[PDB]
Amino acid sequence: TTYKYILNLKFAFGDTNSEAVDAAEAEKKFKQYANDHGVDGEWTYDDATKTFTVTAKDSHADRVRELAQRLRQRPRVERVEITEVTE
């Protein structure tokens, strides 16, 4: 009866020294697509330049199907994957 959606985003670069981090492009793009379709969730950081997790909570299966189909098309900057979790 109760189901929750979770989107995964992978971010990594081939550098030796790390000082700067990119979070404005992933937070502005995820907030634009989620606020345009109607998806409420939370953001979570996983290590510096490695992995990025994001939670997605919706009532209807139309907003999570349009967000998962329009986001997962062609990966270039981050890996976009969708998985359903249940308790």
Describe it for me?
- Helices cover 26% and strands 32% of the residues.
- By secondary structure, it is α+β, with helices and mostly antiparallel strands.
- It has one domain (4-14, 21-85): 2-Layer Sandwich (Alpha-Beta Plaits), CATH 3.30.70.
- It starts with a strand and ends with a strand.
Keywords:
26% helix, 87 residues, protein fold switching, alpha+beta, de novo protein, metamorphic proteins, monomer, 2 helices, Alpha-Beta Plaits, fold evolution
Instruction: Tell me the domain tally.
Output: 1
C-alpha Rg (nearest Å): 14 Å
CATH class: Alpha Beta
Helix/strand-derived class?
alpha+beta
Please summarize what this structure is.
This protein is of the alpha+beta class and 87 residues long.
List the helices and strands and how they pair.
Elements: E1 4-10, H1 24-37, E2 40-46, E3 51-57, H2 63-71, E4 79-85
Antiparallel strand pairs: 1-3, 1-4, 2-3
